[PDB]
Design an enzyme around this catalytic site. Structure first.
Site, PDB file in Angstrom:
ATOM      1  N   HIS B  14       0.845  -1.191   0.000  1.00 15.05           N
ATOM      2  CA  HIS B  14       0.000   0.000   0.000  1.00 15.05           C
ATOM      3  C   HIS B  14       0.884   1.247   0.000  1.00 15.05           C
ATOM      4  CE1 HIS B  14      -2.496   3.290   1.422  1.00 15.05           C
ATOM      5  NE2 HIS B  14      -3.542   2.597   1.001  1.00 15.05           N
ATOM      6  N   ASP B  16       0.877   4.379   1.081  1.00 19.37           N
ATOM      7  CA  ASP B  16       1.158   5.050   2.352  1.00 19.37           C
ATOM      8  C   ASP B  16       2.073   4.197   3.217  1.00 19.37           C
ATOM      9  OD1 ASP B  16      -0.327   7.415   1.940  1.00 19.37           O
ATOM     10  OD2 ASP B  16      -2.165   6.442   2.660  1.00 19.37           O
ATOM     11  N   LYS B  17       1.825   2.876   3.258  1.00 15.13           N
ATOM     12  CA  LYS B  17       2.676   1.985   4.046  1.00 15.13           C
ATOM     13  C   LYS B  17       4.068   1.819   3.442  1.00 15.13           C
ATOM     14  CE  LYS B  17       0.325   1.459   7.629  1.00 15.13           C
ATOM     15  NZ  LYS B  17       1.606   1.460   8.413  1.00 15.13           N
ATOM     16  N   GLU B  42      10.268  12.337   6.250  1.00 15.46           N
ATOM     17  CA  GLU B  42       9.030  12.107   5.517  1.00 15.46           C
ATOM     18  C   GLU B  42       9.347  11.512   4.149  1.00 15.46           C
ATOM     19  OE1 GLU B  42       6.893  12.538   7.581  1.00 15.46           O
ATOM     20  OE2 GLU B  42       7.285  14.349   8.767  1.00 15.46           O
ATOM     21  N   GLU B  55      14.344  16.277   8.127  1.00 17.56           N
ATOM     22  CA  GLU B  55      15.467  16.825   8.871  1.00 17.56           C
ATOM     23  C   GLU B  55      16.190  15.695   9.577  1.00 17.56           C
ATOM     24  OE1 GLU B  55      12.179  17.791   9.726  1.00 17.56           O
ATOM     25  OE2 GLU B  55      12.142  19.218   8.052  1.00 17.56           O
ATOM     26  N   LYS B 166      -5.632  -4.067   0.908  1.00 17.74           N
ATOM     27  CA  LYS B 166      -6.396  -3.456   1.984  1.00 17.74           C
ATOM     28  C   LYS B 166      -7.413  -4.467   2.486  1.00 17.74           C
ATOM     29  CE  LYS B 166      -7.451   0.938   1.802  1.00 17.74           C
ATOM     30  NZ  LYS B 166      -7.977   2.289   1.437  1.00 17.74           N
ATOM     31  N   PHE B 235      -8.347  -4.805 -10.158  1.00 19.05           N
ATOM     32  CA  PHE B 235      -7.367  -4.098  -9.336  1.00 19.05           C
ATOM     33  C   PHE B 235      -5.986  -4.496  -9.860  1.00 19.05           C
ATOM     34  CE2 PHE B 235      -6.052  -3.352  -4.568  1.00 19.05           C
ATOM     35  CZ  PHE B 235      -5.102  -2.425  -4.978  1.00 19.05           C
ATOM     36  N   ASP B 243      -2.182   5.329  -6.671  1.00 19.92           N
ATOM     37  CA  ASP B 243      -2.557   6.186  -5.548  1.00 19.92           C
ATOM     38  C   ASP B 243      -1.281   6.720  -4.910  1.00 19.92           C
ATOM     39  OD1 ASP B 243      -4.249   7.370  -3.551  1.00 19.92           O
ATOM     40  OD2 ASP B 243      -3.937   5.635  -2.217  1.00 19.92           O
ATOM     41  N   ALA B 244      -1.214   8.030  -4.687  1.00 23.73           N
ATOM     42  CA  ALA B 244      -0.043   8.606  -4.034  1.00 23.73           C
ATOM     43  C   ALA B 244       0.028   8.173  -2.572  1.00 23.73           C
ATOM     44  CB  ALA B 244      -0.074  10.131  -4.116  1.00 23.73           C
ATOM     45  N   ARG B 249       0.122   8.574   7.103  1.00 22.52           N
ATOM     46  CA  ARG B 249      -1.258   8.665   6.670  1.00 22.52           C
ATOM     47  C   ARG B 249      -2.025   7.394   6.988  1.00 22.52           C
ATOM     48  NH1 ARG B 249      -2.435  12.651   2.659  1.00 22.52           N
ATOM     49  NH2 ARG B 249      -4.311  11.418   2.223  1.00 22.52           N
ATOM     50  N   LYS B 250      -1.472   6.548   7.851  1.00 21.96           N
ATOM     51  CA  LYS B 250      -2.131   5.324   8.296  1.00 21.96           C
ATOM     52  C   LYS B 250      -2.041   5.216   9.814  1.00 21.96           C
ATOM     53  CE  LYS B 250      -3.923   3.850   4.577  1.00 21.96           C
ATOM     54  NZ  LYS B 250      -4.322   5.291   4.467  1.00 21.96           N
ATOM     55  N   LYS B 270      10.778   8.870  12.775  1.00 22.85           N
ATOM     56  CA  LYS B 270      11.066   9.726  13.927  1.00 22.85           C
ATOM     57  C   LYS B 270      11.859   8.972  14.991  1.00 22.85           C
ATOM     58  CE  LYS B 270       6.622  12.281  13.394  1.00 22.85           C
ATOM     59  NZ  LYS B 270       5.352  12.572  14.117  1.00 22.85           N
ATOM     60  N   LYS B 274      11.129  12.374  19.561  1.00 23.06           N
ATOM     61  CA  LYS B 274       9.805  12.768  19.090  1.00 23.06           C
ATOM     62  C   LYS B 274       8.780  12.015  19.925  1.00 23.06           C
ATOM     63  CE  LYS B 274      12.351  14.359  15.578  1.00 23.06           C
ATOM     64  NZ  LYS B 274      13.845  14.444  15.689  1.00 23.06           N
ATOM     65  N   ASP B 276       5.690  12.055  19.892  1.00 25.76           N
ATOM     66  CA  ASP B 276       4.627  11.459  19.083  1.00 25.76           C
ATOM     67  C   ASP B 276       4.768   9.945  19.042  1.00 25.76           C
ATOM     68  OD1 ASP B 276       3.285  13.801  18.374  1.00 25.76           O
ATOM     69  OD2 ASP B 276       4.205  13.912  16.370  1.00 25.76           O
TER      70      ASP B 276
HETATM   71  C1  LIG Z   1      -9.016   3.741  -3.917  1.00 22.73           C
HETATM   72  S1  LIG Z   1      -7.363   4.512  -3.868  1.00 22.73           S
HETATM   73  C2  LIG Z   1      -7.759   6.175  -3.230  1.00 22.73           C
HETATM   74  C3  LIG Z   1      -8.416   7.125  -4.219  1.00 22.73           C
HETATM   75  C4  LIG Z   1      -7.475   7.558  -5.335  1.00 22.73           C
HETATM   76  N1  LIG Z   1      -6.435   8.443  -4.820  1.00 22.73           N
HETATM   77  C5  LIG Z   1      -8.293   8.205  -6.445  1.00 22.73           C
HETATM   78  O1  LIG Z   1      -7.756   8.915  -7.298  1.00 22.73           O
HETATM   79  O2  LIG Z   1      -9.512   8.018  -6.493  1.00 22.73           O
HETATM   80  C6  LIG Z   1      -6.714   4.002  -2.266  1.00 22.73           C
HETATM   81  C7  LIG Z   1      -6.226   2.579  -2.169  1.00 22.73           C
HETATM   82  O3  LIG Z   1      -7.190   1.683  -2.678  1.00 22.73           O
HETATM   83  C8  LIG Z   1      -6.514   0.583  -3.255  1.00 22.73           C
HETATM   84  N2  LIG Z   1      -6.876   0.468  -4.673  1.00 22.73           N
HETATM   85  C9  LIG Z   1      -6.282   1.087  -5.740  1.00 22.73           C
HETATM   86  N3  LIG Z   1      -6.910   0.707  -6.870  1.00 22.73           N
HETATM   87  C10 LIG Z   1      -7.894  -0.160  -6.530  1.00 22.73           C
HETATM   88  C11 LIG Z   1      -8.831  -0.861  -7.269  1.00 22.73           C
HETATM   89  N4  LIG Z   1      -8.879  -0.740  -8.591  1.00 22.73           N
HETATM   90  N5  LIG Z   1      -9.733  -1.674  -6.616  1.00 22.73           N
HETATM   91  C12 LIG Z   1      -9.705  -1.806  -5.249  1.00 22.73           C
HETATM   92  N6  LIG Z   1      -8.769  -1.114  -4.518  1.00 22.73           N
HETATM   93  C13 LIG Z   1      -7.886  -0.308  -5.152  1.00 22.73           C
HETATM   94  C14 LIG Z   1      -5.016   0.851  -3.133  1.00 22.73           C
HETATM   95  O4  LIG Z   1      -4.582   0.237  -1.938  1.00 22.73           O
HETATM   96  C15 LIG Z   1      -4.958   2.351  -2.966  1.00 22.73           C
HETATM   97  O5  LIG Z   1      -3.827   2.809  -2.253  1.00 22.73           O
HETATM   98  C1  LIG Z   2       9.234  20.908  16.603  1.00 21.76           C
HETATM   99  S1  LIG Z   2       9.015  20.705  14.803  1.00 21.76           S
HETATM  100  C2  LIG Z   2       9.022  18.888  14.640  1.00 21.76           C
HETATM  101  C3  LIG Z   2      10.379  18.215  14.774  1.00 21.76           C
HETATM  102  C4  LIG Z   2      11.308  18.523  13.608  1.00 21.76           C
HETATM  103  N1  LIG Z   2      10.843  17.867  12.390  1.00 21.76           N
HETATM  104  C5  LIG Z   2      12.725  18.114  13.985  1.00 21.76           C
HETATM  105  O1  LIG Z   2      13.593  17.961  13.123  1.00 21.76           O
HETATM  106  O2  LIG Z   2      13.011  17.932  15.172  1.00 21.76           O
HETATM  107  C6  LIG Z   2       7.227  20.763  14.592  1.00 21.76           C
HETATM  108  C7  LIG Z   2       6.592  22.127  14.675  1.00 21.76           C
HETATM  109  O3  LIG Z   2       7.028  22.815  15.828  1.00 21.76           O
HETATM  110  C8  LIG Z   2       7.066  24.197  15.533  1.00 21.76           C
HETATM  111  N2  LIG Z   2       8.428  24.708  15.731  1.00 21.76           N
HETATM  112  C9  LIG Z   2       9.452  24.731  14.821  1.00 21.76           C
HETATM  113  N3  LIG Z   2      10.534  25.291  15.398  1.00 21.76           N
HETATM  114  C10 LIG Z   2      10.202  25.637  16.665  1.00 21.76           C
HETATM  115  C11 LIG Z   2      10.902  26.244  17.692  1.00 21.76           C
HETATM  116  N4  LIG Z   2      12.170  26.607  17.526  1.00 21.76           N
HETATM  117  N5  LIG Z   2      10.278  26.452  18.903  1.00 21.76           N
HETATM  118  C12 LIG Z   2       8.970  26.077  19.098  1.00 21.76           C
HETATM  119  N6  LIG Z   2       8.274  25.479  18.074  1.00 21.76           N
HETATM  120  C13 LIG Z   2       8.885  25.266  16.885  1.00 21.76           C
HETATM  121  C14 LIG Z   2       6.667  24.365  14.070  1.00 21.76           C
HETATM  122  O4  LIG Z   2       5.275  24.599  14.045  1.00 21.76           O
HETATM  123  C15 LIG Z   2       6.948  22.999  13.489  1.00 21.76           C
HETATM  124  O5  LIG Z   2       6.151  22.674  12.368  1.00 21.76           O
HETATM  125  K   LIG Z   3      -3.676   9.306  -1.640  1.00 21.68           K
HETATM  126  K   LIG Z   4       7.494  16.769   9.930  1.00 19.89           K
HETATM  127 MG   LIG Z   5      -7.976   6.905   3.105  1.00 21.09          MG
HETATM  128 MG   LIG Z   6       3.451  15.863  15.372  1.00 21.66          MG
HETATM  129 MG   LIG Z   7      -3.686   7.387   1.661  1.00 23.12          MG
END
Ligand SMILES: C[S@@+](CC[C@H](N)C(=O)[O-])C[C@H]1O[C@@H](n2cnc3c(N)ncnc32)[C@H](O)[C@@H]1O
Ligand SMILES: C[S@@+](CC[C@H](N)C(=O)[O-])C[C@H]1O[C@@H](n2cnc3c(N)ncnc32)[C@H](O)[C@@H]1O
Ligand SMILES: [K+]
Ligand SMILES: [K+]
Ligand SMILES: [Mg+2]
Ligand SMILES: [Mg+2]
Ligand SMILES: [Mg+2]
Ligand SMILES: [Mg+2]
Lengths: 380, 380
Positions: B14, B16-17, B42, B55, B166, B235, B243-244, B249-250, B270, B274, B276
């Site tokens: 998938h 996203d995965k 990311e 970063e 899925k 499929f 699909d991007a 996102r999961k 992360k 972090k 999170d």
């Molecule tokens: C349905 S797509 C999401 C919508 C898409 N971004 C669009 O343009 O409509 C999301 C996920 O569904 C699954 N998928 C993609 N094509 C499919 C298909 N033809 N039938 C069933 N699932 C599908 C894949 O895992 C994909 O990442």
């Molecule tokens: C702390 S950064 C997330 C961690 C980062 N990706 C890293 O490399 O550690 C997430 C958010 O915190 C906020 N942020 C960025 N710099 C900051 C700073 N110096 N002090 C407090 N908040 C900050 C911004 O909104 C940023 O999108």
């Molecule tokens: K997508």
């Molecule tokens: K980030």
């Molecule tokens: Mg979705």
């Molecule tokens: Mg966060």
């Molecule tokens: Mg997605």
């Protein structure tokens, strides 16, 4: 039986929220020319870069450079001194047509009323009688703090403010037979990007007196409330320069701040056939209608779908013990008053109108201007 | 008092995965050379492209082309006929150093025990006695369906299977004084990418008999269970071509499938600073320890932080009415048995070990190999 609950929000210049706003600006641009555009736009941002990627099938002719740069300008990133500039950043577009394997299943040849769910998935809606917008106090206050800072920035009253900001509000609640009653603000966190001229003590004083005290009802604040204001001590580097941003990475900010529940789907960048968005809006609409009808004080609604199938696979109602009716009775009320097929939701909630960029910051819920926030009067 | 609850999962291919796995493969590659690497990676994927951005501050020397392409190869995308090929895709790297404004606040000059939270935020942990792994049945079954398909694909027993998949499982539950007891499987959805040779009826029969019946305990299935197997009917286009994909996102697939609650933060890409990630792992650890100690049958734990501050701003415990002790008593137990500063969590849970790519598919929780899944014996 007092307990704490925390929610957070972010401002328009937060890099994840920049992407949400750009993704929905692209969606709006398409819907203005082609109301039936199929849009799944992901945006990524990092130092000097906006990348648009995803899938769009549309008859619209959209100037992506204009749409992206206009959005960044409105957010306020217009100079390298702020770390990001709509005039000089790189805009990269990697947009393809929607997969034909998806299209044949979801919508090809079908009447609008019969369009299938654009994907499988689960969605939740939630409502609570603790505020007049039927939203948790924690998330509403967090949104309002960011919006107040953006107002002070754009008016020039605090010229050292920059667009990237985050807020966090911890509220102490008591419970009342499953309902929740906010009692006091326990902690507030604010971090906001700033220029080099302003001093730390001035910033903290302004955040307390011109932001917090302008937004939070005084009855909730007291002498023991904890304030973490500019807690890092220095936040000059910000926006995409400080942290990469991506569409759909603020889904709990976008909804209920951790209350209720979430099915995982992002909202921004997606047209109504993506039930991640339309069915979450509809579920919010159902939940708020149940609360406003006096049927409960707190309610969570779950719905789920299979790709290509219009009718939901399941619907569930949880009232946390705050309804006299049983949840099976409430389910009957829902089935008698709503049709949760995506091709009906689009009509009930007018989901082809290009209003989505408005939803992409300060929360999708709790704002009476949107159709899913106008309760339906229930027969029961 | 029966109710439905739905959860979903996705397979290794998938999109996203894919990004979650690549982001954590990058994290692992850095941790193997520099245990103190600061990583916020990311990943974005779309037709023919993997973009790494974010970063990283690290002494490690990492071959990003090798790490990315090795990950895609292991997932199974090795031919243009499958829509994606590790040999010939574009790998773009936009990685910068961590902001010095963040570093000075979070960790510079500090002893490891005193490291501040890397960001503000809220995190939740959840546990339920309804399965022996203390997880919701819905999400466990959804994960297992995808893992079974990947096994059948890699063994060659179903050669028409491709990596993108899925699943979605709806279970009917009864409640028992706040606890939940699974009763039957109501609906199962499976969609999996396939080659052109296989017929639809053969695919649906194999998904029922070689996937579902191998994974779902038969006592939960009956003649009225609803099966949506390959519901789109075709499929063939899949993976990043269809699909991007984007890291983070999961997040509901990654955790509890909609049960419990979520604070919004993504896990993959992360390092332990972090919160999170590390504090969500710790909160799961606390919740599971409470359930295994017999103190409750179901529990939700919330924690929250401010950037630069080591000690949590708030901690909350909700037992859904399943504990004899009050939540204030349970809070006492937690404070006596855990130290939820990130610099202590990293030691208790060994969070510098390069094991994160394993977490990036099939769920971060419910798998006994991970340290946050080994309960702490509680004194109370
Ligand atoms: C349905 S797509 C999401 C919508 C898409 N971004 C669009 O343009 O409509 C999301 C996920 O569904 C699954 N998928 C993609 N094509 C499919 C298909 N033809 N039938 C069933 N699932 C599908 C894949 O895992 C994909 O990442
Ligand atoms: C702390 S950064 C997330 C961690 C980062 N990706 C890293 O490399 O550690 C997430 C958010 O915190 C906020 N942020 C960025 N710099 C900051 C700073 N110096 N002090 C407090 N908040 C900050 C911004 O909104 C940023 O999108
Ligand atoms: K997508
Ligand atoms: K980030
Ligand atoms: Mg979705
Ligand atoms: Mg966060
Ligand atoms: Mg997605
Ligand atoms: Mg983020």
């Amino acid at each position: 039986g007092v307990f704490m609950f925390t929610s957070e929000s972010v401002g328009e210049g937060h890099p994840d929220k920049i992407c949400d706003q750009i993704s929905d600006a692209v969606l709006d641009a398409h819907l203005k020319q082609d109301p039936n555009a199929k849009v799944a736009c992901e945006t990524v941002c990092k130092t000097g870069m906006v990348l648009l990627c995803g899938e769009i099938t549309s008859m619209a002719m959209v100037d992506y450079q204009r749409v992206v740069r206009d959005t960044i300008k409105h957010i306020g990133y217009d100079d390298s001194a702020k770390g990001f500039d709509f005039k000089t950043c790189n805009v990269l577009v990697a947009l393809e047509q929607q997969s034909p394997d998806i299209a044949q299943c979801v919508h090809l040849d079908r009447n609008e009323e019969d369009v299938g769910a654009g994907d499988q998935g689960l969605m939740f809606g939630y409502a609570t009688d603790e505020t007049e917008e039927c939203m948790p106090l924690t998330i509403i206050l967090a949104h309002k703090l960011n919006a107040r800072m953006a107002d002070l920035r754009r008016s020039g009253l605090l010229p050292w403010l920059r667009p990237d900001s985050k807020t966090q509000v911890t509220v102490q609640y008591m419970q009342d037979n499953g309902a929740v009653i906010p009692v006091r603000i326990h902690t507030i966190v604010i971090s906001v990007q700033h220029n080099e001229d302003i001093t730390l003590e001035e910033m903290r004083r302004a955040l307390k007196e011109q932001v917090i005290r302008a937004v939070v009802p005084a009855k909730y604040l007291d002498e023991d409330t904890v304030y973490h204001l500019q807690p890092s001590g220095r936040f000059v580097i910000g926006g995409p320069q400080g942290d990469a941003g991506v569409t759909g990475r603020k889904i709990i900010v976008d909804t209920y701040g951790g209350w209720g529940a979430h099915g995982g789907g992002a909202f921004s960048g997606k047209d109504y056939t993506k039930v991640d968005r339309s069915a979450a809006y509809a579920a919010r609409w159902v939940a708020k209608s149940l609360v406003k009808a006096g049927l409960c004080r707190r309610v969570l609604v779950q719905v789920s779908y299979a790709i290509g199938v219009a009718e939901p696979l399941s619907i569930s109602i949880f009232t946390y013990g705050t309804s006299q009716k049983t949840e099976r009775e409430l389910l009957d009320v829902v089935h008698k008053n709503f049709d949760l097929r995506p091709g009906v939701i689009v009509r009930d909630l007018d989901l082809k109108k290009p209003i989505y960029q408005k939803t992409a910051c300060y929360g999708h819920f709790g704002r009476s201007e949107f159709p899913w926030e106008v309760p339906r009067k229930l027969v029961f």
